[PDB]
Structure formats: structure tokens, C-alpha cells
């Protein structure tokens, strides 16, 4: 009786939200950006190849100086690379080799990683002893760690396969806030540039926008047909793009609270692993299971170019803060740095 | 053209590269085994004989190091992390023979043996384990022998025309699991009957792993 009545009210509320989004869907982003000229063909060459990982690379993250990056592989090794020289700055042996994510702190003093061990480990890069040591192991998730991102030297947000995201106080080792509401494994998260909000994509084919300080879900974004594997905020923080197993990328708007554009091709039938934007946001770069990275025109939904330099899955990618280059990590155990030439 | 500190930084990278190769060579001598199975299927008893997330067991038998991984605690979606175990030497699957007549507690109407068959079929025919051999352990053979006298195999298999002897009943179950394999050419299934008092289970794994490694070596050297 009471349960049946309540679940009927949820359906009425869902229709109310759907009608509200349809009311403000006066135009389409495709119609708005029809007049602007296309970006042309985007040609990028492999400037660097980072060798030394002996297994599938699962994650990479640029440092904020646009020169150092950290990559994670399931050979149990965290490696910090000097991308300008291809020098290895550090090699961190992992206690658990089943790593799925890695993060570089914006200060550059810490890196984080974690996987099937359900632990987010914090590593101190600046010690008087001259070696990288574990500073904290964040326990509390009951599923695998899928993504992690530093807010500062003391706070980090983690997404897990136990359907929840958590905000952690690194000094005390406790999760101050728990973000619940996903009905599937949360596979990725992206921080807003001001670090007041973050979006997460789960296996329920939905993306939720969370308030870091308040700790509740502000908005829910649906439209994908399969698990979301990747998510990335637009550079101004007013939009984000997702990548799913349905071979599509979608651009959702925070303020319009709905999808704006879909990035798919008939030839593309493989899942998407990673998504990122260029510095101006005009380009959307996506990594695919078909060993390639497709560069999309964000405004016009045109495939601007292809980065074909890997013999296995493109598992991760990232664009530097200055926008100079893009790195692609792959299951073939190599990292490549790309940019164009005049 | 490099500076004094640049040459030292390059030399540091060479030291790191040297240590990464040594770790890779050391990790290349380890046999990675993925341990799977349902609950109350002798999965924990096997680990005892072999001596919050993934549980790893290390043991050495005849100058061979084994890394066995248990992923029973992972209640998340299997397909999101099952590719992380692509490239293991073999998969060890544990099935309780005594659970042929028992009913799964959660469903209350599904036979335990059929539950193991569905789990075995999905893992064996998974796209990430096309070339991965499976070591099949049929535990609780002593308890299965006792239950055969009381309860025949007809409960588990309505279309079973065999006798009620222990040898015929056990052999029929072994063939049913091996018939679930669709990649007969690319992979091989090793089946063993284990008990609580058995001590040859580690020997069976060592023999099964050595056969798999040799076949992989022949494939790598061009003979296979």
C-alpha cells in the first residue's frame, strides 16, 4: 500500500523532470554551432614513447607543471616520467599489483593509486630520506577502487565498485563524506576546476553531479545505454562529457540539466575507455577499445582526427594543463605523447 | 649537449630501467593462478592444502613459485575487472561434488551443481580466457560417495541413464563440465578429484601448470 503509492510518486517526479528538461530544449547545440567553421583535420605525431612498464597500463595523470606525469600498470609499478626527456623520475613498487587508477596531486608532493585491493594508497614524493614512501592507506571501500582525484594535499575523492564515492581526510585517514545514490559500480569521476563539485559515471548508465561540501547529489544525467567508463569536465566547469560501452560520447550541460550532443560513428562499435578535453574545450579526445584515440569536434560533433599508435586498448589519456600535449596509455605497456605541428 | 645534472638524471633513469627489468624477470618466474568457485565448494580447503579485496596466496613447489588470487570478496560486477586477470597461467575452479542434490540457499529452488555449471560456463567461455587452461577440482568426493547411496544422481540430472556406482556417477559429472567448454582447440581442462585428506592436489597443479607452460613456450617458439 504505502510502498506502491510511493513508487508511483517517483514515476510522477521523473516525468516532471523530463518535462522540465524538454521545456528548455528550445534549440540544439548542433543548430547553434552550424555556422562556425570546422576545426579542419587535426594531425598529431608521437613526440615521445615512454617505455619501461612490462604489463597493461591502466591509468595515467599529468602533474600540474605539464611536464611530470604518473602512470600505473599491473606489473605492480608506479612510474613518474619526465615527459620532456623521457627520464624516469621515480619508480614506486606497489604492494598490490592490481592497480586500476592513479592520481597526481596538484602540489606535486603526492601520488595516489588503488585497485582490486579496495585501498587508496597515498605516496609521499618529497621526503628527507630520498625515497617514495606510503604516507596513508585509505580503507573503507567494500569494492575495487576505480578512480581517485586530489583536491589538495589533505583531501582526495575516490570512486569505488561498491556503488559509492567518498571524500577522504588524508591526515586522519577517515572518509569525511560518503556519496551514495549510484545503483552500479562507479567507474570514474572528474573534479570541477574550482573543486566544489564533481561528476561520477557508474555502471547504471547515469552520471551524477555531487556537491563536495554539502555531500548530496545535485543532478542526475541519463541517456547512455551501457556502463559509463569515463567522464571529464568542460574547462569552464559548466558541462561534462562521458564515454560508455555503447561506442558513444555525450556532452551534458549542468545548467540546462540535459544532454547537448552525441559523439558516435557507424564504424565505431567498441567501448570507450577515456575522455578528455583540449585546453579551450574545442576538442574532445576519446580512447577506444579498437586501439585508437579519436579526436572529436566538441561543438560540431565531427571526428577531427585519429591517434593510431597503439597495438592494444587505449586505456587512459590526459591533456596537460597548458594544453601543449596529450598522453595516451595503453594495454600494450607504452605511453605516447602527441601534439601537432604548423 | 646535456648539462652536468642532466647526465646524472639520465644515469638515474638507467638505474631505474635496470631495476624494472630485474623485477620483471623475477615476476616472470611466478605462476599466476586465478582461484574461482562458489561458496561451500571446498575453495577455502584447497588453499589450506596449497599452503578486504583480493586475497593472494604464495607457495612454492619444486622450485616453482605460485601466486594464487582469490576474488570471492569482490561483490562488484565481474566483467569490469575480469580482464585484469587476462594472462594468468591457469584458472583453478573448485566444485563440490556433494552439492549435486543440495539447493542454493539464496534462490531456494536452484540446484547448487547447476549454479556451478553456469559459473564454469561463463568463465570458461569468457572472451578474456580464450587461451587460458582451467584446472578443475571436484571436492568433497568422500561425502559425495556417501550421498550417492542415499540420493541418486537423478535429482541433479533428470536425463541420466547411468548406474548409481561411485565411479560412474563421478565420471558423468566430470564429462558434464568438460562438455561446457567451447574452446576445445585453444584451451584444455584438467580435472582432479580432491578430498580433505588428499595431499596430491599440489602435485596435480604443478603437473597441470608445467603442461600449460610448455604448450605456451612451443607457441612462442613457433612449433605450436
Amino acid at each position, epitope marked *: 500500500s504505502e510502498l506502491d503509492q510511493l513508487r508511483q510518486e517517483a514515476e510522477q517526479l521523473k516525468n516532471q523532470i523530463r518535462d522540465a528538461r524538454k521545456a528548455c530544449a528550445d534549440a540544439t547545440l548542433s543548430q547553434i554551432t552550424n555556422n562556425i567553421d570546422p576545426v579542419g583535420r587535426i594531425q598529431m605525431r608521437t613526440r615521445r614513447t615512454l617505455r619501461g612498464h612490462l604489463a597493461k597500463i591502466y591509468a595515467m595523470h599529468w602533474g600540474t607543471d605539464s611536464r611530470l606525469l604518473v602512470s600505473a600498470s599491473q606489473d605492480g609499478k608506479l612510474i613518474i616520467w619526465d615527459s620532456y626527456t623521457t627520464n624516469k623520475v621515480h619508480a614506486i613498487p606497489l604492494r598490490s599489483s592490481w592497480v586500476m587508477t592513479c592520481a597526481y596531486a596538484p602540489s606535486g608532493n603526492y601520488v595516489a593509486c588503488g585497485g582490486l585491493d579496495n585501498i587508496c594508497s597515498i605516496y609521499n614524493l618529497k621526503t628527507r630520506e630520498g625515497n617514495v614512501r606510503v604516507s596513508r592507506e585509505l580503507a573503507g571501500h567494500t569494492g575495487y577502487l576505480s578512480c581517485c582525484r586530489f583536491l589538495d594535499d589533505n583531501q582526495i575523492v575516490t570512486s569505488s565498485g561498491d556503488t559509492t564515492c567518498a571524500l577522504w581526510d588524508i591526515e586522519t585517514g577517515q572518509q569525511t563524506t560518503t556519496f551514495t545514490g549510484h545503483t552500479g559500480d562507479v567507474m570514474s569521476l572528474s573534479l570541477a576546476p574550482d573543486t566544489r563539485l564533481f561528476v561520477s559515471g557508474a555502471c547504471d548508465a547515469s552520471a551524477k553531479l555531487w556537491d563536495v561540501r554539502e555531500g548530496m547529489c545535485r543532478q542526475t544525467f541519463t541517456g547512455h545505454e551501457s556502463d559509463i567508463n569515463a567522464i571529464c569536465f568542460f574547462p569552464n566547469g559548466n558541462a561534462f562529457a562521458t564515454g560508455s560501452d555503447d561506442a558513444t560520447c555525450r556532452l551534458f550541460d549542468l545548467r540546462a540539466d540535459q544532454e547537448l550532443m552525441t559523439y558516435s560513428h557507424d564504424n565505431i562499435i567498441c567501448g570507450i575507455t577515456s575522455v578528455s578535453f583540449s585546453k579551450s574545450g574545442r576538442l574532445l579526445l576519446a580512447g577506444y577499445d579498437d586501439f585508437n584515440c579519436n579526436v572529436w569536434d566538441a561543438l560540431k560533433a565531427d571526428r577531427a582526427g585519429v591517434l593510431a599508435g597503439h597495438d592494444n586498448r587505449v586505456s587512459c589519456l590526459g591533456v596537460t594543463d597548458d594544453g601543449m600535449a596529450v598522453a595516451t596509455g595503453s594495454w600494450d605497456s607504452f605511453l605516447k605523447i602527441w601534439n601537432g605541428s604548423s | 649537449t646535456l*648539462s652536468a645534472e642532466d647526465k646524472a638524471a639520465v644515469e*638515474r633513469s638507467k638505474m631505474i630501467d635496470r631495476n624494472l627489468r630485474e623485477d620483471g624477470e623475477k615476476a616472470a618466474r611466478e605462476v599466476k593462478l586465478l582461484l574461482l568457485g562458489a561458496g561451500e565448494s571446498g575453495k577455502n580447503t584447497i588453499v589450506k592444502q596449497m599452503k578486504t579485496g583480493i586475497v593472494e596466496t604464495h607457495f612454492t613447489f619444486k622450485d616453482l613459485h605460485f601466486k594464487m588470487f582469490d576474488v570471492g570478496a569482490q561483490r562488484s560486477e565481474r566483467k569490469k575487472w575480469i580482464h585484469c586477470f587476462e594472462g594468468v597461467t591457469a584458472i583453478i575452479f573448485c566444485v563440490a561434488l556433494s552439492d549435486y542434490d543440495l539447493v542454493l540457499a539464496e534462490d531456494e529452488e536452484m540446484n547448487r551443481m547447476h549454479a556451478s555449471m553456469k559459473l564454469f560456463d561463463s568463465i570458461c567461455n569468457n572472451k578474456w580466457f580464450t587461451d587460458t587452461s582451467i584446472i578443475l577440482f571436484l571436492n568433497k568426493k568422500d561425502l559425495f560417495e556417501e550421498k550417492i547411496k542415499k540420493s541418486p544422481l537423478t535429482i541433479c540430472y533428470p536425463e541420466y541413464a547411468g548406474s548409481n556406482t561411485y565411479e560412474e556417477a563421478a565420471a558423468y559429472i566430470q564429462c558434464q563440465f568438460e562438455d561446457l567448454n567451447k574452446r576445445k582447440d585453444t584451451k584444455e581442462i584438467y580435472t582432479h578429484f580432491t578430498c580433505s585428506t588428499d595431499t596430491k592436489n599440489v602435485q596435480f597443479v604443478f603437473d597441470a601448470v608445467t603442461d600449460v607452460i610448455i604448450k605456451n613456450n612451443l607457441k612462442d617458439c613457433g612449433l605450436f
Partner: single-chain antibody
Framework: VQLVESGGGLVQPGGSRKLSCSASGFAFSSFGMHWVRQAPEKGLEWVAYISSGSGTIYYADTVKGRFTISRDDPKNTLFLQMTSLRSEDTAMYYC??????????????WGQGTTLTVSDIVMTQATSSVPVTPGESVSISCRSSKSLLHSNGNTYLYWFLQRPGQSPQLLIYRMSNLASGVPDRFSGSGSGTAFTLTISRLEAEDVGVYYCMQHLEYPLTFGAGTKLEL
């Protein structure tokens, strides 16, 4: 982090002596090691360098062929085998650790030193002494015969402070970066061949001798040193 030197003492001319540097509290095998000596009432002089992994070894010309530098990584000991010792070798010998990667701070920790008594880019610090008063800003100038700015954008100039009775401590590395544990009042500014170390709001602890060192190429050379006195 500790670096204790031993083996120094009065030796006869033409003799041999073995200096040891025991390291504790840090990953010794990860750091390159230098020997730096200081003649009594004189400035710093670099002696030798051995890299991490013992693959690269450098010597100063005044000691090459007579001194041998070696390390024992399992024992965390740095060695300096000296032969044919001359009266020119009478100095306090310091054990200095230095690690080299992008963003590292070489020459960050020095040992207390051991005293031995026996019976090229030019770095110039023309101002030998500077009278100072507490709370007032002081600037120290250094010059080099060659440009210390490399084509990679780094300017390999270092600043050290040796308080009376203490081992030198790193203040500024690569001409602008502030060493860990150093107050922000110290600031390093330079261009090309001319460099300035500015000390805002001078305090009693800042009193000492200041050395500018170049790390552009070997042999590493020090300036004469500028002394601050009250």
C-alpha cells in the same frame, strides 16, 4: 639524516689516509656523493664525486691520480682513499649527499666533516666581508666567467651558508629555488653571469659566510665567499 666522517688526523707528508663517511637515516644508495674540503681560513673546494650506482666518478685536477673515492652501499659508507698527501691537502673534508632528478635539490645535506692535517669556471665574490645590522636587508653578489644559464632553461648556481662552527647548508639551488627548511626571507635573483642573494630582515642566525657554487659542469667551483658580520 646523518653523515658522520672519520679517519682524519695528523699525517706525515707523502703518506696515505682513508676517510670514511657513514650514512644513516636516508637511502644512501639513491644519492650521489661528493667530497668537499675547506682549507683553514679559506673557502670551499670540491674534491671528488661518485654517482649513485658507482657508475660515474669525477675528480678535481689537484687531486686526480692521488685520491680514490668509493662507496659501500650495503654498509652505507662513503670512502676517500688518499695517497701522496701534501701540505696543500690540509683541510676539513665534508661528506655531501646529492640526488639528481627533475626538481631535485642537490647538495642539500652536508656532514660535520673530518679534519686532516699534513705536516674551469671562475666564481667571483669580490666583497669579502659585509657589515650588517639585524632587521636590515642585505644583498650578496656573485659573478661567473661563463654563463651558468643552460640551453634547457636552468641556471646552475647554488648558494650555501656556513655558520661559524657549523657545516655548510644549502640556501638556494639553481639560482632561484629555496631549499627545504630555509626561511622565505632568503631570495635568489640572477641573470646570465651576475647573481644576487637577497636576505630580507636579517637575523642573528644568518650571520656567517656565504658561498656561491656552479653546477653547470665539472669540476664544481666555489666562490671565495662573502662574510656577514654584526
Amino acid at each position: 639524516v646523518q653523515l658522520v666522517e672519520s679517519g682524519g688526523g695528523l699525517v706525515q707528508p707523502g703518506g696515505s689516509r682513508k676517510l670514511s663517511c657513514s650514512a644513516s637515516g636516508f637511502a644512501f644508495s639513491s644519492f650521489g656523493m661528493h667530497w668537499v674540503r675547506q682549507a683553514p681560513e679559506k673557502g670551499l673546494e670540491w674534491v671528488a664525486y661518485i654517482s649513485s650506482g658507482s657508475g660515474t666518478i669525477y675528480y678535481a685536477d689537484t687531486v686526480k691520480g692521488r685520491f680514490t673515492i668509493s662507496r659501500d652501499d650495503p654498509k652505507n659508507t662513503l670512502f676517500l682513499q688518499m695517497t701522496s698527501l701534501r701540505s696543500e691537502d690540509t683541510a676539513m673534508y665534508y661528506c655531501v649527499r646529492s640526488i639528481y632528478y627533475y626538481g631535485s635539490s642537490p647538495f642539500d645535506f652536508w656532514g660535520q666533516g673530518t679534519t686532516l692535517t699534513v705536516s674551469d669556471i671562475v666564481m667571483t665574490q669580490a666583497t669579502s666581508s659585509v657589515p650588517v645590522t639585524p632587521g636590515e636587508s642585505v644583498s650578496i653578489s656573485c659573478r661567473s666567467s661563463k654563463s651558468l644559464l643552460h640551453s634547457n632553461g636552468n641556471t646552475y648556481l647554488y648558494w650555501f651558508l656556513q655558520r661559524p662552527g657549523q657545516s655548510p647548508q644549502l640556501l638556494i639551488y639553481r639560482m632561484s629555488n629555496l631549499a627545504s627548511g630555509v626561511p622565505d626571507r632568503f631570495s635568489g635573483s640572477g641573470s646570465g653571469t651576475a647573481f644576487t642573494l637577497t636576505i630580507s630582515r636579517l637575523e642573528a642566525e644568518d650571520v656567517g659566510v656565504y658561498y656561491c657554487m656552479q653546477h653547470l659542469e665539472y669540476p664544481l667551483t666555489f666562490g671565495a665567499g662573502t662574510k656577514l658580520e654584526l
